[PDB]
């Protein structure tokens, strides 16, 4: 349908070669590569038209190369990668008949290049059942989820009520917290809330699950530590309804 980017998340060690791939919209002829951070904003890197580069002045002097082998595929290689490469990389495409054509944006790839993988941890997920004072006082029931101790910040939290994903009545922190607020290595914590009516929580036939998708190491990566290798995984916590 829209502009496709692969991968979506990437967590890798420095020195590795990072390959980002984009597929423009069918029929589109210009393709743009952007970068986003908080300090520099939306930064044009390079953009093509009919598979020919038009402006690559935004490309760094070293380690960044991009090419478009055919009309529906472009790549952007970072070799070798560095920690400062960590950003959200966007690919956009237009019809390519005018410089003023509307740009459609893909979902973007969040790339985190680490110094080393010694500090990577998956999250621990705990669900906290609604206060009975809150049920008594407001006739509503708030569930709280805590995803704690993960690094880096590549987590996606989601609530699943009765096997199906819900979005209403759910507020999760826009930004996580540093457990050690004075460390570059510091692992993160993240909280969520799912508030339902007292009637819905007190039905023991309702199933609540807090799901946290973590993005970490891959198959190619290696592990020289006697703790569980922090691969990409999904850590869940769940609770059943309680009438009393």
């Amino acid at each position: 349908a829209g502009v496709i980017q692969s991968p979506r998340h990437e967590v890798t060690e420095m020195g590795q070669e990072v390959t980002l791939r984009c597929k423009p919209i069918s029929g589109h002829n210009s393709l743009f590569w952007y970068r986003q951070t908080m300090m520099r904003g939306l930064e044009l890197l390079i953009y093509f038209n009919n598979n020919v580069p038009i402006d690559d002045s935004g490309m760094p002097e070293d380690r960044f190369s991009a090419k478009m082998p055919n009309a529906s595929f472009s790549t952007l290689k970072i070799q070798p990668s560095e920690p400062r490469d960590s950003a959200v990389y966007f690919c956009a495409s237009t019809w390519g008949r005018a410089s003023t054509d509307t740009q459609y944006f893909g979902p973007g790839t969040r790339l985190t290049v680490l110094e080393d993988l010694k500090n990577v941890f998956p999250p621990e997920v705990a669900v906290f059942e609604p206060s009975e004072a809150e049920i008594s006082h407001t006739q509503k029931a708030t569930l709280v989820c805590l995803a704690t101790g993960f690094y880096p910040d590549h987590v996606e939290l989601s609530w699943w009520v009765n096997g199906k994903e819900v979005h209403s009545g759910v507020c999760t922190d826009p930004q996580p917290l540093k457990e050690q607020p004075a460390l570059n290595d510091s692992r993160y914590a993240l909280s969520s809330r799912l508030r339902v009516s007292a009637t819905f929580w007190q039905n023991p036939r309702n199933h609540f699950r807090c799901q946290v998708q973590f993005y970490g190491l891959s198959e190619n990566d290696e592990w020289t530590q006697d703790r569980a290798k922090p691969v990409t995984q999904i850590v869940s916590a769940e609770a059943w309804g309680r009438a009393d």
Binding site: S30, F32, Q36, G41, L42, L44, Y47, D55, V88, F90, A92, T94, S99, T100, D101, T102, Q103, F105, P107, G108, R110, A126, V127, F128, E129, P130, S131, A133, E134, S136, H137, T138, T142, V144, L146, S168, G169, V170, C171, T172, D173, P174, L177, E179, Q180, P181, A189, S191, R193, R195, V196, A237, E238, A239
Partner: protein, 199 residues
């Protein structure tokens, strides 16, 4: 000479009230386009509005409207009857020698109107433990400043507004936890409403 300046980097608006997001530009080519892009927390870029240089200033009563001052090279974005779904980052963009030049953005936050505030600090307990605890500050008014922690071992999240999507209900919520700590003392560095409920 293709610039886009969004000087106010953060903006707030009361729910259902009107906010104007500023943008000024400089260009060289007299044939340019102007854009507004919305970026929700998903990081997806969605085009809000799009204007052409040598066309009129619209006589449009849509919820998302534009104020185009070509002589002043200004390009406001007006949002009427603001909703909580409007809370996102907004980028003003130019289209000249470079097809798209972005401004540095404006984080717009939409304050929910809480008309039935029931400030309370509750204690929840773990489904599989019920010995590791959390404290939930909830249902306070939207002007309440809940601030971060001071202890190195107590963690306080900022407030979060949820929309139950039924009964037009909204509620603010902040979480605090610490393995050490009691709920009656968790948010006492934030100015708590006088009528806050401690069961």
């Amino acid at each position: 000479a293709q610039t886009v300046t969004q000087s106010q980097p953060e903006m707030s608006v009361q729910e259902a009230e009107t906010v104007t997001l500023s943008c000024t530009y400089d260009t060289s080519e007299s044939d340019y386009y102007l854009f507004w892009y919305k970026q929700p927390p998903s990081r997806q870029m969605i085009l809000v509005i799009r204007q052409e240089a040598y066309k009129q200033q619209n006589a449009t009563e849509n919820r998302f409207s534009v104020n185009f001052q070509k002589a002043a090279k200004s390009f406001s974005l007006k949002i009427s009857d603001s909703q909580l779904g409007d809370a996102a980052m907004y980028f003003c963009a130019s289209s000249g020698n470079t097809p798209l030049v972005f401004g540095k953005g404006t984080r717009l936050s939409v304050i929910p109107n809480i008309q039935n505030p029931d400030p309370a600090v509750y204690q929840l307990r773990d489904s599989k433990s019920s010995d590791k605890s959390v404290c939930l500050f909830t249902d306070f008014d939207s002007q309440t400043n809940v601030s971060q922690s001071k202890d190195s071992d107590v963690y306080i999240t900022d407030k979060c507004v949820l929309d139950m999507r039924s009964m037009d209900f909204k509620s603010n919520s902040a979480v605090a936890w610490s393995n050490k700590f009691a709920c009656a003392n968790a948010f006492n560095n934030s100015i708590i409403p006088e009528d806050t409920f401690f069961p």
